[PDB]
Each structure stands twice: as structure tokens, then as C-alpha cells.
A paper describes a structure:
During maturation of human immunodeficiency virus type 1 (HIV-1), capsid proteins (CA) assemble into a conical core (or capsid) surrounding the viral genome. Formation of a core with optimal stability is a strict requirement for efficient HIV-1 infection. CA folds into two distinct domains connected by a linker: the N-terminal domain (CANTD), composed of seven α-helices and a single β-hairpin, and the C-terminal domain (CACTD), composed of a 310-helix and four α-helices. The cores comprise ~250 CA hexamers and 12 CA pentamers.
Residue 38 is located in the middle of the helix α2, which together with helices α1 and α3 form the 18-helix barrel at the center of the hexamer. Consistent with the previous structural assessment by NMR33 and compared to WT CA, P38A CA exhibits subtle changes that are dispersed over a wide region. The affected residues are located proximal to the site of mutation in helices α1 (E29, K30), α2 (P34, E35, V36, I37, mutation site A38, M39, S41, A42), and in the neighboring intra-hexamer subunit (marked with ΄) in helices α1΄ (L20΄, E28΄), and in α3΄ (T54΄). Moreover, the changes extend downstream from the site of mutation, altering the preceding loop between helices α1 and α2 (A31, F32, S33). Thus, the P38A mutation initiates a cascade of subtle changes that alter the network of intra-protomer (CANTD-CACTD), as well as inter-protomer (CANTD-CANTD΄ and CANTD-CACTD΄΄) interactions, thus altering the structure of three neighboring subunits within a hexamer. The structural changes cause a decrease in the calculated interface area (IA) at the inter-CA interfaces that likely results in the observed broad destabilization and “loosening of the CA structure”. Notably, in the P38A structure (but not in P38A/T216I), these changes also affect the network of interactions between E45 (which is at the top of the α2 helix where 38 is present) of one subunit and residues of the neighboring hexamer. In P38A the interactions around E45 are altered, leading to an increase in the electrostatic repulsion between E45 and D51, and destabilization of the P38A CA hexamer. Under these conditions, P38A CA does not assemble into tubular structures; however, tubular assembly was rescued by T216I. The vast majority of CypA-DsRed puncta disappeared in less than 5 minutes after membrane permeabilization of the P38A viruses.
Author numbering:
A (entry chain A), B (entry chain A), C (entry chain A), D (entry chain A), E (entry chain A), F (entry chain A): 1 to 4, 7 to 221
């Protein structure tokens, strides 16, 4: 990665960042917390470090291939919006990057460092990072076993655990924040068990989750 | 985070800070020492690092949603007290942050760094940190199984263990320091077993905890 | 903490310092080596880092409350000896700290850093550290099960192990160095088994521990 | 390695980089993720650090000898393309390296540092690294047990696992990207079980892997 | 410790240095490799760091008391050879240290840093370190179970293991290098079993250990 | 060690370098990868750090004594080739080192640092390192159980494992690169089982190890 005297300086990815990432993928497979951990360990990372984290993943090669295809689609879109102009790169200048240069496959470390440290800066690491997080979101969608519509509270299930399951499944859903707001406003109270459902409906439509959980504590 | 030649310099969150936090949440669930550990690992942290620590938490998504709602309430309060003024940001200036900018959802890393390193400084990391600790206190309240009124000394229980339980439950209570002072002055001596209660009452109302524990040592 | 180009620079407490301290308290409970480890891990620490180490302790809340009361007594004594003078803090100056400012409860990180880096320096971290070590000494006193007067050598016990026990119990005793010198000069030879006691008395009152241990080696 | 004030500074290889590499070779034997981990841990490395990583490998000495022979072939090719010219090295100059100087066997650390920090730079570490990755690719080829032509989907095998196996075996194949593209376009759909094969053929030749996996989800 | 821009800068003792030392004392008790590890972890250490390493030792308080007495004897000797002169410390000067100042009991961290960074330097850390290593040598002497005169080769014992035992016991012996040279020249060949003894005596008095071990390989 | 602003700066040996070395010697005893690990962990090391690594080795004191004798022989040879000249060391100069000064037994840390940072540099650390690696090579020779002449392929042994054994034993042999080349050209094909031997002889005398291993894959 690169960390900011004032100037931004280059640095190699640490061995325990790599070991942490590999352990995370080995243990947790693909889940939202794996994506959060990815963005955590890849702060200020170059495309070389991102490809470094991706290529060290053993197994799960179906998901890795899906991620490759997503990255290729985003790169082709970048090439459509940003057409490269033929010509000689002038002294004191750097070429404009392609989608493959952002993915680190056709660019050198010096070129990525120059794009990132330039003023104005071309943040290739955060763009490639954006594409990677997109594909990872697709993977987490495909590998989620349950749908949010099937999360129902058991007859003897404490409301707390039911909320744990509900928002666990909701975090993996692929829907805009408005759709998830609707799911919270409708499905959470709708799919509770009758004993808790009646009380929550007695609370009102504008209650917080704290009030809903403290209401069905005894039930 | 950011650490202070004299100037404050930016730095990425370390992998063992993240691993420490994730291990803490996995092992201890939600307790006061988890909050102390959070403030410990988040010294000088930016909102990006705070969201980094929060999003890497697997499970406990009910508590995470409650924390989201609390953060949204504090952000709306900030927006009420601090209304943004429409206009063009002048050269050599930075915009005043919203509640969502403090929460790191609508602000960039450069903007947070600029707000924190400015003179006068706008400490967005400590404000967002304050909100997070508030919501975490609410969670620790809701998830505490026992009330302080139910902590009673067993007939054969050593006074030391009874004090351990009493202040363990007291640390999770949500009450001002004056209320907790009253609880110490009344409930601790009131709820001891008769053999120790009579001796402590023979000591007097102004004895320290050291004197109370060394008094009921033999009992 | 703060580490000394020549200038003293601030730094956040490391995650493995915290993990080391928490592991120490979890494993060893309260013993002299725990205090030595505390002073070890808290070299150059600010009151914020000291409160950081104290608040991360799970359990043992009776001892933590005793430590709080001791810190409050030392703070009240500081307030008695150092009365604050009402007035406006002049430009280029910093206010004189209270006992609560030394304990880090009513002071900011910038104020502690300014007090510590000033010339003349107000070492709030070493003062608060002194109070903490005092209270910890009180706790170690209260939680010591055995008295030094009860450490007696068994009939078949090697003298070496008896000395191990004797100085183990002596390290936890609360007595000035002169009293401990008297205990070494009297109780050690007095409480040995007769076979070793007679030989040690044949050595003389001015023998070293090396000579005493090498004398009763065969016995 | 060497990390970039602006100047490139030398640094010794860290003990946990070495321990990470040795653990990787001990656990995973020879696989593509081992190569990715090698390039990960050897960012900015000198030939001395590369030989350091190679020589610390216990066992697998057949593969290490094959790697030695490959490195010798690449070095002889470098000597053929770059003939050394006899003469005295002028003041303010450095000799042009041989293949053995790139492999670090006949060059000193100061000479490698000088070649890498020079302008124009002679990147001996990335050249030797290239040769090493070449030989490692040969080894991974030889030690792959299965061919891509034999990866067939079981009758009750979920399509996801079959894709995992297919691209796992494909990653170890030695073929240009065009040949692997043909393998993806032909063998993947050809070697699926009939129930999934018919559906995938109903999709069309231009479907993505995401669509192919979400199509045969229920089958 | 203190590490050398050119100037010597102060630094706090690392948590894994402490953990390493504590683990070493817990596992290996008192042996020569423990002393080597002490000098290893205490490179450039101040008396505060040395007392830090010593006080964190749990148990073995007999040996710790012996070490205290040895340190006190060396300190009294220093006070005899270096008498302090009464007077006022002049501006731009520092007082000459006592034996207790070298032991870190009556001196501050600033005074130790000033003594060590001065020109001419007063190396209090290496002097106190010398005393500590002396006392540790006394302890290792007292706690050695076997004498070098009792190390004899078994009838079926390989010569290699017998040499391992011989020099293991010899490393713990308290004798000058000349005495140990005599022990090597006499006892090693004298105490071997007859089958190996006759061959070694056939070699001659001037053979190396390599020749002696390769001679009795088959026996 | 010492790491290169441009100037070479001194640094203490890290605790995990020491722990890594001690673990390596404890686990692997004496093998070539132990020597590679030694040179790995001792990059830029001073004689004090080399003696630090050597003295922390518990057990194996026969090998350590052999290493001492080898170091003494190399030191005596250095004294023969480099005779010290009697006289006063001039201001702005440093004395020429003896063999014992290179071994770190009769020289201080400041003298080693001065010898290494001087221009022209006297690399005492790499010289002492050379001697240590020499003695370690002698030890690895003596402790190798098998000779290269006895490595023969089993009747049902895969050729790959036989090559593993062959080059494992060859790496521990003490022979010049030409002798080892002859061993590769003769013994490897000579000592294979008849089924593989005939095929390898059908290949020809100029085949690579890759071709030899891929030829006897099916056998
Ligand atoms: Cl690291
Ligand atoms: Cl790869
Ligand atoms: Cl998967
Ligand atoms: Cl852009
Ligand atoms: Cl579920
Ligand atoms: Cl780290
Ligand atoms: Cl998230
Ligand atoms: Cl929870
Ligand atoms: Cl503000
Ligand atoms: Cl309880
Ligand atoms: Cl750390
Ligand atoms: Cl707290
Ligand atoms: Cl306790
Ligand atoms: Cl003061
Ligand atoms: Cl006891
Ligand atoms: Cl390291
Ligand atoms: Cl090697
Ligand atoms: Cl292998
Ligand atoms: Cl080139
Ligand atoms: Cl397979
Ligand atoms: Cl550390
Ligand atoms: Cl102590
Ligand atoms: Cl002991
Ligand atoms: Cl001196
Ligand atoms: Cl023995
Ligand atoms: Cl370290
Ligand atoms: Cl030693
Ligand atoms: Cl051995
Ligand atoms: Cl030289
Ligand atoms: Cl073998």
C-alpha cells in the first residue's frame, strides 16, 4: 500500500495482512464480513496488492472466475467511457490508464504509484477496489442459502435470536437501501411469531429496534 | 488512525488491531470491557477506521442494527444543531460536515483527514466515536441479564466474590455516577448476608471498600 | 505512550501491549509480577493509556473498585496540597492540573501531552502511575493468603524450596525495607527445620543467602 | 527488500516473511497459490532475498533442482543476448551483470543494490524473480495429478463444486490465455452432467459463469 | 533500550521482548542459554529496562534474592572505588552515579539516559548488566546438579551423546578458560569408555574434537 | 544488525529473529536449511549478533564446541595472514582487527560498528559469518547419516521420491560443484531401478531433470 512530512510513500504489503486475508477466506468462505475485512486490509492498496490478495486465495476458483468476469466487464465499461487517444506520451506526463491497467494486469508498479501520487490523482487502487467489491457482492449474493422472505420466528424462539437471523440474512441481500428499509418496516413485524407479533403491532409502526426488542423481552 | 516533528500523519489500521477487535467480539460478546477495548484500539481513529471495526463484526446483527439506529439519531441531532449553509466552498476552505459525513458514509478519507488536521480541528473521529460508545452502552444495557437489585450474598459465599458480582453487575448498569454512588451506599450493605451485614453495619456508613472487605474476611 | 531528533512524540498504545496486559491479569490474577508487568507495559504512558489498561480488565471488579477509591484518595490529597487558583489561562500557558486531570477523567489527550512535553514538565503519567501502583500494592496485600510468620520449612523439604516460599510470601508483604531486613535476619533462620537450622546457626549471623543455601544443600 | 522522502532504501527480509514462506511450502507443497504467495512475499526483493527464500525450503529437492536448471537455462540465454565486454569499469560506473549476477550467486549485495537503485535501473530482482516464477510454473505443471480433460461433473454433484474442480485444475494447466479461453468455452459445458448440460446448452454460447451457475442451481 | 542520523534515541522495551524473557524463565529455569537470551534481549538496555526484566520473573525468588545480594555487593564495591564528592552540580553537568544509581533504584530514567548519551559516556546499563550476568552465573553454578568429574561415557553410549553431556555440564561450570582447557585435555579422554578411550589415545594429545568424534563414530 | 537517507544505522536483533533461530535449531537439529535460515536471519549482523545467535542454542554442545574450534582455526589463520603492528592508534583512525576481534570476543560493539561503517569498510560481520557457515558445514557433514553412494531407488518407489532422497543427501555432501556435477551425471542414472534405468539410458546423457522425471512418470 501507500501511506501519507506530507508526501505519500510506497510500502510492500505486510505478511500478516496476507496471512490475515488467507485465514479469513479459509475460515469464513464468502460473507459480508469477509468483504469488510478485505476493504480493511486493502486501505491505500495498489492494484498489485489487490491482485496479490486475490491470487493467494486457494480454492473457491468458481467465485474467483466470476470475480474475473465482473472485473473484465467493469474494465470494458471503463474503456467505453474513457477511450485512449493515440500519440506520444510527452515528457513530464503519464499515459491515461486502460481498464486492464486499473486491474494491474497491463501496468507496472511504477505506473500505478505515479497515477496515485499525481496531482490530480488517478485513484486506480480505489477504482479496482470498487470493481472487486462489486464482484464480491455478486458472489455473496449467489452463495447466500436463505432468502429474507423465509426468515420466520420460531414459536419458542427468543425475539433477539430471530432479529439476529433476520438482519444476518438481510446483510447478504442485494437490494437498495430503500428496499431494505421496506423489508425492515414490513417483513420483520410480519414474520414474527403471533405472541410477539401482536405486541409489536400494539407498539406502532414508528418504533425503534431497541423498543421492539425490549418489548418482546419477556415473550 | 492518525499519530503525531510535530505534524499529524495518517496511517492505516493495523491487521492485529482488527484481529484483536474481531477476537474480542467473538469471545466476550458485548460487555463493558469490550467497549474499553474498542476505545483502546480506536485511539486517533478516523470514521473510516471506526466503520472498519464495526463492519468486520460477524453475527450480533441485531446489536449492530441498534447501533446503526443510534448513530442515525445522533446524526440527525447534529444536523438539527448544525444546519449546513448552501454556497460554494471557497479556495483554502473545507465544507462543514453533516451527521453522515461524521459517520463516514458520505465523506472521503481525504475530507476526514482534513477535518481532523485542520486548525481549528473538527474532531469527527472522536464525535463518531462518542456516538458509537453511546449505542454500545445501550446494547450492553439491553443484554445485561441481571439487575443490581438482585445481587445478594449467599449464606456461605465469601464477601469478596459477592463484591465481584455486585460491581460486575453495577458496571453494566445505565445510571449516573450519583445513582451508582447511592447503590454503593445502600444496596451493597443491604444485600449482604446477615453475618457480614451486621459487622459492616458495626463499621459505620463512612467505611471504604478495603475496610469492608478486610472486615468480613473471616466470615 | 510518548517516546523521545530529540523531541518527545506521541504514540497510541500497541495492541500487543493491551493483549499482554489482559492475558497477564487473566492468568496471574493479582501478584507482584503483575505490578512489575504493569510498570513494564506502561513506560512513558499517558493517563489515557493507564485508564486504557485498567478499564480493559474483565472481572476482579472488587479490586478495581478498591483501586478507584485509592486513586480518589490520592487525588483529593493532591487537591489539598495543590489548590487551583481561579483566573483566565494566559496565552502561551496551560492550566495547573487537578487530581481528576491527573487521573485522566477530566482532562483531554492534548492537555496530558502538553503537561508531559512542557518545560518544566508536569509528569502526570508517572504521578497517576504512582497512585495506581499504590492501590495495586494494597490489593496484592489484601489478596495474599499466607503471612510471612507462617512460612516454615518441612521436615523433608529441601532448603531451596523453603527459601522460594519464604521470599515469595515476603515479596507480597507490605512492610518497609527495614522490616523486611529484620524478617530476613530473624524468621528465615528461625523457621527452618532443626537439621538445617542448627547448621545455619553454626554459620553465623552475617552469612549471605548463597552461603546459607550451599550450606544446607546436602540436608 | 528495498522500499521507496523519495529515495529507495535497503532493508533485510523480515523473520515472519521467511516463516510465512516456509510454512506455505511445508503445508501446501507446490500449487499456484504458493507462487502467488511467493510473489507476494518477494515484492521489491533483491536476488539475495530470493535465494534466501529458495534455500530455506526443506525437502522437495527434486523441484528445487529443476528450478536450479531452469534458472541456469534462463541465465545462459541472458548471457547469449547480453555479451559482457572486456574492459576496466570506469569511475562512477558499474559493470553490466551476467546471468549468474542476476541469480545472486556471483554478485554482492552492494552490486545488486547499485543495479536496482541506478538510473536507468537494472531490475535484477524482478528478472531473477521472473526466472524463478517460470521454473515454479514448470514444477506446478509436472506435479499436477489431473488433466483438464478428465474433470467431469458427477451425476449428483452440484454444479458449483464441479466448477470449483474445473477451474482448480485449469489454474495449474500450462496453456496460453487463448487455449484456456477455448477450454472454458468447450470443456466446461461439454463435461457437465446431462441434466445440467442440456440447460446450459439452452442458455447459449455467450452466457457468463454467473448465469451458468445460477441456471443449474436447482439441478 | 536506546538505539543509534547518528544520535542515540530512547525507546521503551517491547512487549514481545518481555514476553520472550518471561517465557524463557518459565520454561528453562536457570541455564546458560537463559543468560545468553538475557544479554540478547537486553542489548542497549537502561537500568530501568534491566530491573523491568528482573522484576517480571515469577517464582525463583531465592535466586532473585541471591541476585539482589550480588548486585548489592558489586554496588558497594563501586562505591568503594568511586567515592562521591559533596558539592553542587554545576550547570551543564550531571552528578557521578552511585552503585544504587547504576542499579536503577535511586536514579531516574532521564539521569540514566543522560549518563549513557554523554560524551564521555558512562555506560550504566552495561555495568549493571555486568553485575546481573555475574549473579546469574553464581545462580547457574549453584543450581547445576552434576559436576564435570562425574560425566562418564556409558558402555553402549555413542561418543556423540557423551560429548553433548560433557560440554553441557562444562558450560555450567565456574572455572577460568584455562581450567576448562585442562578439563577438555584430560577428563574428556579419561572418562570415555574403554573401547573409545583406547582409540582416542591412539589418536594423540593434539587431535581436534572433529577428529575425536569421527574416530569413535563406529564404536 | 545494521541497515542502510544513505547512512548505515545500528539496530538491536529482534526478539522474533532470536525466537525463530532457537525454534529452528530445536526442531530441525543441523541440516542445510538450518544454515540457510542462519544466513537469512543474520543479514547485516554484527559479530555481537552472531555470537548472540550461537550462544542461545541449548544442547548440541558437541557441535557448538566443534564450531568454536573451527572459528579459532580461522582466527589463527587470519592472524597469520594479517599480523598486527605495534604502535599508537592515531586520532581519526581505528586499529586493525585480530581474529578474536572478528569473532566478537575481544572487541566492543562500537569497534565493530566502526569497522563496518568505515570507508573502506572492514566487513567483520560477513567474515565471522563466513567462518560460522564453514564450521556449520563441517557439522552438517559429520551428522549426515547416509552417503550419496547408498541412495538407491526401490523396486516400487516412484522416481520422484528417489530424486527427493538423492538430492536431499547430495545437499549435505561436502564436495565441490564439479564433484556434485559428476555425481548427478553418474550416480543418479546408475542407482535407479532397472525399469526406470533403462528408459533414462534410452533418453541420453544430456537430458534435463525435468525430462528424466517426466520420462519415468508412468513407471
Ligand atoms: Cl509485518
Ligand atoms: Cl495466480
Ligand atoms: Cl465458495
Ligand atoms: Cl479519475
Ligand atoms: Cl437463518
Ligand atoms: Cl501490524
Ligand atoms: Cl458491511
Ligand atoms: Cl449479542
Ligand atoms: Cl467541532
Ligand atoms: Cl451474578
Ligand atoms: Cl503492535
Ligand atoms: Cl470502563
Ligand atoms: Cl481478584
Ligand atoms: Cl509537578
Ligand atoms: Cl507457601
Ligand atoms: Cl518482523
Ligand atoms: Cl543452501
Ligand atoms: Cl514436491
Ligand atoms: Cl535491463
Ligand atoms: Cl478434481
Ligand atoms: Cl512489539
Ligand atoms: Cl517488583
Ligand atoms: Cl530456580
Ligand atoms: Cl565509567
Ligand atoms: Cl548428564
Ligand atoms: Cl520484533
Ligand atoms: Cl554463553
Ligand atoms: Cl546435534
Ligand atoms: Cl578487509
Ligand atoms: Cl534416504
Amino acid at each position: 500500500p501507500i501511506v501519507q512530512q506530507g508526501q505519500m510513500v510506497h510500502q510492500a504489503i505486510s505478511p500478516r495482512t496476507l496471512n490475515a486475508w488467507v485465514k479469513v477466506v479459509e475460515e469464513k468462505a464468502f460473507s459480508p464480513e469477509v468483504i469488510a475485512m478485505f476493504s480493511a486490509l486493502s486501505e491505500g492498496a495498489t492494484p498489485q496488492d489487490l491482485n496479490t490478495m486475490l491470487n493467494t486465495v486457494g480454492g473457491h476458483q468458481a467465485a474467483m472466475q466470476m470475480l474475473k468476469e465482473t472485473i473484465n466487464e467493469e474494465a470494458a465499461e471503463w474503456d467505453r467511457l474513457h477511450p485512449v487517444h493515440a500519440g506520444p506520451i510527452a515528457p513530464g506526463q503519464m499515459r491515461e490508464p486502460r481498464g486492464s491497467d486499473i486491474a494491474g494486469t497491463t501496468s507496472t508498479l511504477q505506473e500505478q504509484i505515479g497515477w496515485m501520487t499525481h496531482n490530480p490523482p488517478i485513484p486506480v487502487g480505489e477504482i479496482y477496489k470498487r470493481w472487486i467489491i462489486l464482484g464480491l457482492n455478486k458472489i455473496v449474493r449467489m452463495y447466500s442459502p436463505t432468502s429474507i422472505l423465509d426468515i420466520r420466528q420460531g414459536p419458542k424462539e427468543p425475539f433477539r435470536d430471530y432479529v439476529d437471523r433476520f438482519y444476518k440474512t438481510l446483510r447478504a441481500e442485494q437490494a437498495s437501501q430503500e428496499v431494505k428499509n421496506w423489508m425492515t418496516e414490513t417483513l420483520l413485524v410480519q414474520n414474527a411469531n403471533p405472541d410477539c407479533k401482536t405486541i409489536l403491532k400494539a407498539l406502532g409502526p414508528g418504533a425503534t429496534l431497541e423498543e421492539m426488542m425490549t418489548a418482546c423481552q419477556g415473550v
